[PDB]
Amino acid sequence: ALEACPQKRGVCTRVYTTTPKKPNSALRKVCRVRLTNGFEVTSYIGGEGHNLQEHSVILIRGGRVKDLPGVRYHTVRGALDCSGVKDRKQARSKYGVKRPK
Amino acid sequence: MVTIRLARHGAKKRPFYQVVVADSRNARNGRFIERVGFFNPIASEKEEGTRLDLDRIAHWVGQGATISDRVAALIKEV
Amino acid sequence: RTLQGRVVSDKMEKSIVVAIERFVKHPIYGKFIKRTTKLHVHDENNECGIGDVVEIRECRPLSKTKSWTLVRVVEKAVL
Amino acid sequence: KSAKKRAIQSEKARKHNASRRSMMRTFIKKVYAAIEAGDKAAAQKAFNEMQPIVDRQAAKGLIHKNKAARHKANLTAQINKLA
RNA sequence: UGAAGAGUUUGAUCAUGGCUCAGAUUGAACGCUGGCGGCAGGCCUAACACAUGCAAGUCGAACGGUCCGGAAGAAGCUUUCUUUUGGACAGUGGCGGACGGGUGAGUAAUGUCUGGGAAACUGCCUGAUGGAGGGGGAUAACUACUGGAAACGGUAGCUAAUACCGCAUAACGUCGCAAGACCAAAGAGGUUUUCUUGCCAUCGGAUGUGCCCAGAUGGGAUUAGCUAGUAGGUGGGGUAACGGCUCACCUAGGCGACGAUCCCUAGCUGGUCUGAGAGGAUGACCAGCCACACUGGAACUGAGACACGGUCCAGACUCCUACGGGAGGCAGCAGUGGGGAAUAUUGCACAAUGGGCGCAAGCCUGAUGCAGCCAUGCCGCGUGUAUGAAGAAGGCCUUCGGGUUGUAAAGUACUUUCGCGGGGAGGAAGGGAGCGACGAGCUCAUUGACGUUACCCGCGAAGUAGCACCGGCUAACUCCGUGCCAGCAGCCGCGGUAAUACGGAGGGUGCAAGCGUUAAUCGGAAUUACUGGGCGUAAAGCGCACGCAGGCGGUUUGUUAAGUCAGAUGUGAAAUCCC
């Protein structure tokens, strides 16, 4: 976070997929982000589906992914272009998903 | 200019003025030179409304200490 | 103020430098520490010489560096 | 009021004290010059025209106390010498 | 009256070691979840750029006109016009803007902190002494004319003061020698021969400051020799004053491992938080000090600003413009836009308290006193409180026996919200008027919230509710689906047909809008350990000799007694820490 700030914005450079380590196997969704801090780190994309393109621009939280060595940050869904998960009945507090009527 | 006015301890539902001799420059509730008594507008806390302590102020009076209009009234009441 | 020191130099005229030393405890450890200071005392009579442990008292600043003057000589010599 | 009035006076004010000190350094040098030459009479007489003028400047905010007494002491100290 | 940590390196154990977890705080926020009420609080990100309004005036007991208002005249009425008078705007004249308010960039330095010293100053105010005689001179307003689009400016004429200047008296003060000479000063107003306001000179007081000194004040030497006015002397210049502060001459020193110089960072402090203490971190609200207002530099006038609404010069920007030339700069209040995860009414008002000016009347005062928006926090009520059937439904859990939610899951009443009506606080009384010399003092009246909130009284409807989590640490369970499949995970791990850690459902725990979560600060770590530690094998003794500084060092006596110790006194910044 550099300035030790809770959150930091950044423009995505590429929204590619990565595979877990030895004990796991899947297609975890990540994306390189150029935070305003001047650093280009990779953040994980929580949820079963996102809508992040090339000019996504999403706020970074900060969390290490035991599966993906390097991804020490998590994306905050529900802020900016990062649309919250759809039909999220459970984790709405996270991923940012308004309670259906 | 050394003046003798009232120092408002003023608090939500607690009006108490402290007739003190201090410099005119200093704030109303700043560092004072020496207290000579007190004043209770409502006189509810204690029966003794005010305690001028004549002899005390009698010293500053003439030393160059001037008393305000309001305080003068309380002081005159002795 | 009276200070005691040594005459480590008598090169200048009417001006002698006295090396005063003191012992103070460390603000943290507390152990005694040695600290000295050079003071240019006045000596119009050029009486005091090198090796003389004289007394120093505060007087009218004869100059910018000299604000002290010779009072009395404790001993005779100890280079 | 007119913030300019206080501006013009201050400027013209310096113009005054400027001429006053002029007479000072003009006659003070004259006295010293006379003393240096040896002329006693003409000198002292010229000294009695510098003492007042410098004292009069003290009456106002021209030379003030201190600096005024200084010049008087120095002048009289430079005349009793070369004389 | 003061001290209980845990998880993770092994197949297992001990030792070492780093990381990590719950605590308090922060001028916040995003994600999803909303009722109310008191109190408190709000751009911690771009000193980024800013629309609009506001942020200092006040005096006619200084002087001529205009505007507004009243009264009395010449007149039969009207027009017109005359005199007197109140307020004030324009001008002239006096005082004030360097107080208050905002911000923290810059800054390591007696800048600040603590105690002293003196080569000093101090408007208004207070005490004491003395005095105020005669005279002369100048510039506006106004009047006339001309130039310009405007700002604004040029010329000619008249004129006054508590505006300037020359001479006396000297209480005194200053200067040489030693124990002599020189140098001051404006009235006005009235209940006017009596006071009031003010002035000139001197001493002192009060208060506020300039300057100097001892000690203390972050990180790095992969920053070490550095320095020419640079160190000292004489004389001079300069200033309110000491000082190479500045100049000439002479001398040639001065400083450094008790680390100068250089570089980096940060307003500082009191304090705040934490801790048994020591100590660590921080210093945001409030109080003191310092520094800074378009960027940079400088000077003047003054008691004091080298001075936001003062001035001069350099640079950039925005706006106006018949482009000739001008007007500004909210890191002042509110507010806008941008940025950002993000932080509000371009609201109301002066009576109170306090401040500036005035004799007073009185005027000014978004300083401030309140309201509004946002649960951001805290206090008495988030998803309810109390009441309630051996309990026939529904939601939840289940060993399918049962159990649980038990206003019913219906209702009803509620703490009593909300809402409506009335009264309406100060937790402060004057201004004014009457008595008194509109002085002291006494008496009386008006004005209530801030150009109506709080609280009290009356009336009165029940009047939303959701999120996180349930393998262990973490308090809280199984069935079904899927099946190393999909997925969970801070660490140890779990899932290959019984998975409480995957998705769903019933049930349960937490929060009771907080609780979780994210970020930031402190200790536990006796893992720098002064109190609390180690170096044969775990990280760790220099290969040896010798030797400088330094540290330490036998015994006896005397003086000094600087260190050390003791009594008294001054300061102990204030605030706080502690009680």
Curated annotation (Swiss-Prot), chain A:
Sites of N6-acetyllysine modification: 86
Top-level taxon in the UniProt lineage: Bacteria
Any one GO biological process: cytoplasmic translation
Residue ranges the record marks as coiled coil: none
Keyword annotations from UniProtKB, A to Z: Acetylation, Antibiotic resistance, Methylation, Ribonucleoprotein, Ribosomal protein, RNA-binding, rRNA-binding, tRNA-binding
GO cellular component: cytoplasm; cytosol; cytosolic small ribosomal subunit; ribosome
Something else known: At least 19 substitutions or deletions in 11 codons can promote streptomycin resistance, dependence or pseudodependence; all but one of the streptomycin resistant mutations (K42R) are associated with hyperaccurate translation and thus reduced translational efficiency.
Protein name as it appears in the record: Small ribosomal subunit protein uS12
Species name: Escherichia coli (strain K12)
Swiss-Prot record, chain B:
InterPro entries registered for this protein in UniProt: Ribosomal_bS16, Ribosomal_bS16_CS, Ribosomal_bS16_dom_sf
GO terms for biological process, alphabetical: cytoplasmic translation; ribosomal small subunit assembly
Induction: Part of the rpsP-rimM-trmD-rplS operon.
Assembly: Part of the 30S ribosomal subunit.
Natural source organism: Escherichia coli (strain K12)
Annotated TM spans: none
The UniProt record lists the keyword Ribonucleoprotein: yes
Sequence similarity: Belongs to the bacterial ribosomal protein bS16 family.
This protein's UniProt keywords: Endonuclease, Hydrolase, Nuclease, Ribonucleoprotein, Ribosomal protein
Biological role: In addition to being a ribosomal protein, S16 also has a cation-dependent endonuclease activity. In-frame fusions with the ribosome maturation factor rimM suppress mutations in the latter (probably due to increased rimM expression) and are found in translationally active 70S ribosomes.
GO MF terms held by the record: DNA endonuclease activity; four-way junction DNA binding; structural constituent of ribosome
Protein name according to UniProt: Small ribosomal subunit protein bS16
UniProt cross-references to Pfam families, sorted A to Z: Ribosomal_S16
GO cellular component, one term: cytosolic small ribosomal subunit
Domain of life, per lineage: Bacteria
Keyword Plastid: no
Swiss-Prot record, chain C:
UniProt keywords, alphabetically: Antibiotic resistance, Ribonucleoprotein, Ribosomal protein, RNA-binding, rRNA-binding
Pfam families: Ribosomal_S17
GO molecular function: rRNA binding; small ribosomal subunit rRNA binding; structural constituent of ribosome; zinc ion binding
One GO BP: response to antibiotic
Keyword field contains Ribonucleoprotein: yes
GO cellular component: cytoplasm; cytosolic small ribosomal subunit
Role this protein plays: One of the primary rRNA binding proteins, it binds specifically to the 5'-end of 16S ribosomal RNA. Also plays a role in translational accuracy; neamine-resistant ribosomes show reduced neamine-induced misreading in vitro.
Miscellaneous comment: The strain missing both S17 and L29 grows very slowly and has a rather unstable temperature-sensitive phenotype.
Binding partners and assembly: Part of the 30S ribosomal subunit.
Family, per entry: Belongs to the universal ribosomal protein uS17 family.
UniProt protein name: Small ribosomal subunit protein uS17
Swiss-Prot record, chain D:
GO molecular function list: ornithine decarboxylase inhibitor activity; small ribosomal subunit rRNA binding; structural constituent of ribosome
Region annotation Disordered: where it falls in the sequence: 1-22
Pfam families from the UniProt entry: Ribosomal_S20p
GO biological process assignments: cytoplasmic translation; ribosomal small subunit assembly
Gene Ontology CC, one term: cytosol
SUPFAM superfamilies, per database record: Ribosomal protein S20
Coiled coil: none
Keyword field: Ribonucleoprotein, Ribosomal protein, RNA-binding, rRNA-binding
Signal sequence coordinates: none
Superkingdom field: Bacteria
Main function: Binds directly to 16S ribosomal RNA.
NCBIfam families (alphabetical): S20
Subunit architecture: Part of the 30S ribosomal subunit.
Membership in a protein family: Belongs to the bacterial ribosomal protein bS20 family.
The protein's name: Small ribosomal subunit protein bS20
Organism annotation: Escherichia coli (strain K12)
Gene: rpsT
